[PDB]
Amino acid sequence: MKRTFQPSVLKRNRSHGFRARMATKNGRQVLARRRAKGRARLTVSK
Amino acid sequence: AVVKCKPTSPGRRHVVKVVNPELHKGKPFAPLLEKNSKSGGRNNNGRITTRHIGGGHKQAYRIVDFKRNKDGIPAVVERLEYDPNRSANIALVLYKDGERRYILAPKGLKAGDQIQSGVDAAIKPGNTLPMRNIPVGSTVHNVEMKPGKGGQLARSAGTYVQIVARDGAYVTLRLRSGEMRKVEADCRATLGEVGNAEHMLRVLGKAGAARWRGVRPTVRGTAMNPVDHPHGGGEGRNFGKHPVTPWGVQTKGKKTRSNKRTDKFIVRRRS
RNA sequence: CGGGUAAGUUCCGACCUGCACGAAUGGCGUAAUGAUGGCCAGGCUGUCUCCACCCGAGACUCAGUGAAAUUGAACUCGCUGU
RNA sequence: GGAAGACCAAGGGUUCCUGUCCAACGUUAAUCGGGGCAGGGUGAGUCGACCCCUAAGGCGAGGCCGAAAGGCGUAGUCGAUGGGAAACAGGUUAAUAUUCCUGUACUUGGUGUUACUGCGAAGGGGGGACGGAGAAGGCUAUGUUGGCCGGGCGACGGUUGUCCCGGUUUAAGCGUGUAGGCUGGUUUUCCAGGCAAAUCCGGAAAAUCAAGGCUGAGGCGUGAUGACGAGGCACUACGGUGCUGAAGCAACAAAUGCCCUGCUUCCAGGAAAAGCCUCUAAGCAUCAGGUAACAUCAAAUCGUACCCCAAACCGACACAGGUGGUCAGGUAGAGAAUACCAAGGCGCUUGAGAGAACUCGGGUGAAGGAACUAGGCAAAAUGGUGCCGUAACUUCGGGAGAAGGCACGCUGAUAUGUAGGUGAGGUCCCUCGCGGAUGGAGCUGAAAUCAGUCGAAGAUACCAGCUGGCUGCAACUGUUUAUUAAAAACACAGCACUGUGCAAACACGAAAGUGGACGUAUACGGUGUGACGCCUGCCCGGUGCCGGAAGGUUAAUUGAUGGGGUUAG
RNA sequence: CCGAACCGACUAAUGUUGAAAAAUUAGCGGAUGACUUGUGGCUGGGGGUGAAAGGCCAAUCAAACCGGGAGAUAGCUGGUU
RNA sequence: GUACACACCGCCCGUCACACCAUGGGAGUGGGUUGCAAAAGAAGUAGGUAGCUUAACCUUCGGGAGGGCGCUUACCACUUUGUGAUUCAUGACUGGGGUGAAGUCGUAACAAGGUAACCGUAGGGGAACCUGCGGUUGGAUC
RNA sequence: GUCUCGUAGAGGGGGGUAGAAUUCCAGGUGUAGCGGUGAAAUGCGUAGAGAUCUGGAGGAAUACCGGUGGCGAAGGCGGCCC
Ligand SMILES: [K+]
Ligand SMILES: [K+]
Ligand SMILES: [K+]
Ligand SMILES: [K+]
Ligand SMILES: [K+]
Ligand SMILES: [K+]
Ligand SMILES: [K+]
Ligand SMILES: [K+]
Ligand SMILES: [K+]
Ligand SMILES: [K+]
Ligand SMILES: [K+]
Ligand SMILES: [K+]
Ligand SMILES: [K+]
Ligand SMILES: [K+]
Ligand SMILES: [K+]
Ligand SMILES: [K+]
Ligand SMILES: [K+]
Ligand SMILES: [K+]
Ligand SMILES: [K+]
Ligand SMILES: [K+]
Ligand SMILES: [K+]
Ligand SMILES: [K+]
Ligand SMILES: [K+]
Ligand SMILES: [K+]
Ligand SMILES: [K+]
Ligand SMILES: [K+]
Ligand SMILES: [K+]
Ligand SMILES: [K+]
Ligand SMILES: [K+]
Ligand SMILES: [K+]
Ligand SMILES: [K+]
Ligand SMILES: [K+]
Ligand SMILES: [K+]
Ligand SMILES: [K+]
Ligand SMILES: [K+]
Ligand SMILES: [K+]
Ligand SMILES: [Mg+2]
Ligand SMILES: [Mg+2]
Ligand SMILES: [Mg+2]
Ligand SMILES: [Mg+2]
Ligand SMILES: [Mg+2]
Ligand SMILES: [Mg+2]
Ligand SMILES: [Mg+2]
Ligand SMILES: [Mg+2]
Ligand SMILES: [Mg+2]
Ligand SMILES: [Mg+2]
Ligand SMILES: [Mg+2]
Ligand SMILES: [Mg+2]
Ligand SMILES: [Mg+2]
Ligand SMILES: [Mg+2]
Ligand SMILES: [Mg+2]
Ligand SMILES: [Mg+2]
Ligand SMILES: [Mg+2]
Ligand SMILES: [Mg+2]
Ligand SMILES: [Mg+2]
Ligand SMILES: [Mg+2]
Ligand SMILES: [Mg+2]
Ligand SMILES: [Mg+2]
Ligand SMILES: [Mg+2]
Ligand SMILES: [Mg+2]
Ligand SMILES: [Mg+2]
Ligand SMILES: [Mg+2]
Ligand SMILES: [Mg+2]
Ligand SMILES: [Mg+2]
Ligand SMILES: [Mg+2]
Ligand SMILES: [Mg+2]
Ligand SMILES: [Mg+2]
Ligand SMILES: [Mg+2]
Ligand SMILES: [Mg+2]
Ligand SMILES: [Mg+2]
Ligand SMILES: [Mg+2]
Ligand SMILES: [Mg+2]
Ligand SMILES: [Mg+2]
Ligand SMILES: [Mg+2]
Ligand SMILES: [Mg+2]
Ligand SMILES: [Mg+2]
Ligand SMILES: [Mg+2]
Ligand SMILES: [Mg+2]
Ligand SMILES: [Mg+2]
Ligand SMILES: [Mg+2]
Ligand SMILES: [Mg+2]
Ligand SMILES: [Mg+2]
Ligand SMILES: [Mg+2]
Ligand SMILES: [Mg+2]
Ligand SMILES: [Mg+2]
Ligand SMILES: [Mg+2]
Ligand SMILES: [Mg+2]
Ligand SMILES: [Mg+2]
Ligand SMILES: [Mg+2]
Ligand SMILES: [Mg+2]
Ligand SMILES: [Mg+2]
Ligand SMILES: [Mg+2]
Ligand SMILES: [Mg+2]
Ligand SMILES: [Mg+2]
Ligand SMILES: [Mg+2]
Ligand SMILES: [Mg+2]
Ligand SMILES: [Mg+2]
Ligand SMILES: [Mg+2]
Ligand SMILES: [Mg+2]
Ligand SMILES: [Mg+2]
Ligand SMILES: [Mg+2]
Ligand SMILES: [Mg+2]
Ligand SMILES: [Mg+2]
Ligand SMILES: [Mg+2]
Ligand SMILES: [Mg+2]
Ligand SMILES: [Mg+2]
Ligand SMILES: [Mg+2]
Ligand SMILES: [Mg+2]
Ligand SMILES: [Mg+2]
Ligand SMILES: [Mg+2]
Ligand SMILES: [Mg+2]
Ligand SMILES: [Mg+2]
Ligand SMILES: [Mg+2]
Ligand SMILES: [Mg+2]
Ligand SMILES: [Mg+2]
Ligand SMILES: [Mg+2]
């Protein structure tokens, strides 16, 4: 059966990548939060 | 001509075609074509704002001359053509100086006919004049509402407008709706009726024929749940309320015109 | 009431006493169509009378690997009563 | 074996190859592994990306709009799933190869010579450039048979022949220009069009010639005195290397591939932009620039291993699931169904016995034949082609494959292989060719009829409609509760009412705007009904909607009049 | 219209600590169209989308998920060495 | 003018109720005849002929020819199956018709029959009928 | 039966146009009735009808001529102009 995760790198980067996050103020608050938590990987960006 | 299909399959039994042997069979005139992609009835918020629109055949846009302001130069009809964008047919015309344009095809117009626009044009079908120069009582189409703006009234297949009176700077028109409407006498109009009057005699015959035209199905409000539509609900077929739109406004007689700016031009409403 | 069956609360045709049909929240018909509902017949048969035998895969034994739900504690019988 | 073979994209990321190890991982053992450890392995002007160009859509200087955050959008700038230059065959590694090597090619650009010469764009025109279905003809891939070449003479009767086995392969490029497709050509004069100009496109009028151009599969030639090649021979570290090498033709059949972005036809009427060709403007003037030949230089960078219907991707698993594109042999067959095979790939990571009940998946069954049961659930049955034949009803299409029935293998003859298809030499003609005409050798080859013959059975396996009668509902094909409901529900063409005069009604939106629509009442929205046929009666008291506007009542607003507080007196 | 690929999901058996959190096997429907499919885009939670089943919106839907108000409140149940 | 003549206190129409009779439709069903498509194949006759058996003819004395039986093929009666056509009988119920009798409801026609009658058509109504549209005089009065 | 010349005609088909009248719409004047019948009532009217004047819209039919007149196979055909 077809499952929910059907990977595509272009769609991954367009939807959640670093530059998509930087494009809006709400996305920059995601990055601010993850930096404050100290995540080793800020985004999906490979 | 109006042609019934033979009932060789259930989807063909009720089909009625309008077949016109005079329409061009080849490709349209390319310099007057533009692309025109579809909307699905969605605006720039991406929301459906007009229901029941989607799909259907790809269509190119034909640039049609509704202004008819190339005055004093005669043109000859080269051919009639099918236009997917409208109910009327269109005519490709060649002006004496070598320019080609598309116009709405009036009833009776055929290849070889001559047309002209301007104050001094002859009173003949396909000619365009300011209504100041058109006899009262005439039948016209593609009528301007503001001088120089371009035709806006009576453009659909088989429609026309009657010039019933002329008083000062204004003429009074009887529109197809039955409305009596004042328009400036300097507004242009084309003599005759829009052609292709048999358009309304066609019968689609099957559901798919509406889908070919970009029309998606209509779901009755009484077939829904209450959360979806004021008519929804009921154990069985129930109704019991005054018919309304999906947004709650009465839909069987309640009037919705509210334009005090243009009220001064309506001599008499359609009813 | 009639038909079909040896026998028919279903089915078909009628009657009208419509608890409580009825004319576009349509009425009455309707060829064709339907993995649609009901009923009848021919063919067909292990569906059944009424099961028998056979071929394979498990079940069973040996070697290797090795779960689960559950679980107050158990030295965890019948009966009649309480 | 239309895959369980081969090869890509996506996704993964070393899983690839070699050596070594067997703790853990592997549903068992493991000497083995997609496991551990170590080393190795991915070579490009031509393949792909990057790049030029745009679609939907995104962002968006100014701008318009919005308490703020922000929303929309112009000029622009991004964005492939689409348009845009060029390489093939052979050989080679343990592991890469259109990338390395051998042979033979091609493309774009920079320079520099030479010869000749109106070049010039952010502008104009052309082109690129486009649907569905259907029908053929011409072909090739490919196959089959013959010929040819090499080998064979058979474990058991026969096998020197009308016998057996194998091979019979060769590209891009360059040259040629055929089946076919499209279009009349050429030269002058003139002109309200193409924002200016134009020799270009469009238009008008003459003259003259009638064949001129554009496009185009395949074939043929060359590429190739080469490469490959059955086998043979010699070595092996027995895995394999080294050496040599015959024939290398024809006929017939033939695609879903090519000609074909064609042709015919239909209505639902079928992207864009650049590359490319052409025209001139400002400008430049024996300069630059353009065209051609020749030479020379450059073509960077990143990807390239491996899996890819899967043990490497998505499913927590070495999971009976899911996953877009390409390739398409033989015999039978209508076929990409199905059966058996080829190339190629596999036996599914617990086995060994036994031969109880019972469960699962199957086979057969005396007599009966729906008596079973809620119900013929399940099973059994029917099943092909040709011909004969086929009722009520019907919207005249249907119903219909109604129903029912007959024939069917093999051998011989007709006919040493027929009708038909294909077509060589020859001969004739020619405006001499990839030509026409004639002619038919060779090859291929149904179907039928007559006679005979074997079996219980000839559509023998696999494959492959059960049929008929009465009736409810829905006209019909479609759609739906992903995961207990597929229906009589939803939709539907058709019908009606009603709104809507365009800055339309209506909808999204504090708004700007956007959809409706580059539509205009034969149009668009809402609502109900639901093909078609015959039809659709009475009620306006209630609720709503529409119209009316004389009167009664009534909001903010206005503040007449009366009453009170204070106190100069 | 008949029928493979492809798209579905009418019946039965199995399976129900499955091989599988919806499948397998035998049959079944559509199969040039209101068809099917790849890649990319757009619509956002009282909101979307819906040939309408309250269906679907990441194994979640009569109001998604994540974080916060937050130790909501619990005249109720349990427990209290 | 008249459809009156025991003479308008005349004549007379239709539904409804009652009785009887024939007939159309009808879920269908049961018989007779018959078409079409097949299956079937007794006896007979004809063709063929493995096998068996032979009075007349011919033999070179073994046989030969010819015949018969058997077998087989063709044609075909009985019979069987499927599906139509036609005809007769019958059927709950239902449609109108005739006759009788006169009960109930009216009074359509005959006089200008009290709205002149009638024809075609359409709609309506318990019934005769009424109404619209065109037509006729086979209308009285004037 | 054909040809030549002329005559009368609501013979047919198509198009245009004119005047009278009805209805409706707008406005002016004006005020209590109008309309209808055997008699009435329903209906219309002080929200201004009916009556009268002006302007407009629209459809249908063609007074007088007109005649036991004409034309046409019958059914039928009537303003004027082409
Ligand atoms: K996404
Ligand atoms: K059109
Ligand atoms: K609907
Ligand atoms: K409802
Ligand atoms: K309901
Ligand atoms: K319901
Ligand atoms: K309704
Ligand atoms: K109906
Ligand atoms: K069904
Ligand atoms: K049925
Ligand atoms: K395992
Ligand atoms: K073991
Ligand atoms: K042998
Ligand atoms: K590689
Ligand atoms: K097979
Ligand atoms: K045992
Ligand atoms: K031949
Ligand atoms: K079949
Ligand atoms: K119906
Ligand atoms: K279904
Ligand atoms: K539904
Ligand atoms: K019908
Ligand atoms: K019909
Ligand atoms: K009412
Ligand atoms: K009312
Ligand atoms: K598509
Ligand atoms: K919803
Ligand atoms: K989620
Ligand atoms: K919510
Ligand atoms: K009777
Ligand atoms: K009968
Ligand atoms: K009468
Ligand atoms: K009379
Ligand atoms: K009458
Ligand atoms: K009555
Ligand atoms: K005449
Ligand atoms: Mg709609
Ligand atoms: Mg359109
Ligand atoms: Mg509709
Ligand atoms: Mg519902
Ligand atoms: Mg509500
Ligand atoms: Mg109900
Ligand atoms: Mg009710
Ligand atoms: Mg009974
Ligand atoms: Mg009974
Ligand atoms: Mg019944
Ligand atoms: Mg009802
Ligand atoms: Mg009711
Ligand atoms: Mg009604
Ligand atoms: Mg009703
Ligand atoms: Mg109703
Ligand atoms: Mg209905
Ligand atoms: Mg269906
Ligand atoms: Mg054990
Ligand atoms: Mg590793
Ligand atoms: Mg390996
Ligand atoms: Mg290793
Ligand atoms: Mg182990
Ligand atoms: Mg060990
Ligand atoms: Mg290893
Ligand atoms: Mg390893
Ligand atoms: Mg923007
Ligand atoms: Mg800005
Ligand atoms: Mg853009
Ligand atoms: Mg770009
Ligand atoms: Mg691309
Ligand atoms: Mg490799
Ligand atoms: Mg070939
Ligand atoms: Mg070849
Ligand atoms: Mg031997
Ligand atoms: Mg060659
Ligand atoms: Mg070549
Ligand atoms: Mg195909
Ligand atoms: Mg590789
Ligand atoms: Mg395994
Ligand atoms: Mg798997
Ligand atoms: Mg698939
Ligand atoms: Mg094959
Ligand atoms: Mg197969
Ligand atoms: Mg045992
Ligand atoms: Mg057993
Ligand atoms: Mg069993
Ligand atoms: Mg069996
Ligand atoms: Mg038995
Ligand atoms: Mg037996
Ligand atoms: Mg038996
Ligand atoms: Mg039986
Ligand atoms: Mg029973
Ligand atoms: Mg029983
Ligand atoms: Mg069954
Ligand atoms: Mg079976
Ligand atoms: Mg068949
Ligand atoms: Mg051939
Ligand atoms: Mg019933
Ligand atoms: Mg249906
Ligand atoms: Mg379900
Ligand atoms: Mg289901
Ligand atoms: Mg707008
Ligand atoms: Mg309905
Ligand atoms: Mg589905
Ligand atoms: Mg299946
Ligand atoms: Mg079907
Ligand atoms: Mg099918
Ligand atoms: Mg929220
Ligand atoms: Mg519900
Ligand atoms: Mg879900
Ligand atoms: Mg809530
Ligand atoms: Mg709080
Ligand atoms: Mg709490
Ligand atoms: Mg009878
Ligand atoms: Mg016999
Ligand atoms: Mg009377
Ligand atoms: Mg009378
Ligand atoms: Mg009659
Ligand atoms: Mg009446
Ligand atoms: Mg009357």
Author numbering:
A (entry chain 1): 1 to 46
B (entry chain c): 2 to 272
Paper text:
Further 3D classification resolved a class containing ~650,000 particles of a translating ribosome containing P-site tRNA and a weaker density for the E-site tRNA with the small 30 S subunit in the unrotated state. This is a widely observed state for translating ribosomes isolated using in vitro translation systems. A 3D variability analysis focused on the tRNA sites identified two subclasses with P- and E-site (~500,000 particles) and A-, P- and E-site (~150,000 particles) tRNA densities, respectively. In this map, the P-site tRNA is tethered to a nascent chain (NC) density with weak density traceable to the backbone of the alpha carbons. However, clear densities of side chains were not observed in the polypeptide exit tunnel due to averaging of several states during translation and thus we did not fit an atomic model in this area. At the current resolution, we can observe separate EM-densities of water molecules coordinating magnesium ions bound to the RNA backbone. In addition, we modelled EM-densities for potassium ions, based on their identified positions in a recent X-ray structure. Although the state of the ribosome is paused at different states during translation, we visualised the mRNA with defined anticodon-codon interactions being visible. The highly resolved rRNA in the presented structure allowed for sequence identification of portions of the rRNA directly from the map, where we detected a C-G base pair swap in H79 of the large subunit rRNA. This swap is due to sequence variation in the E. coli B-strain, compared to the MRE600 strain.
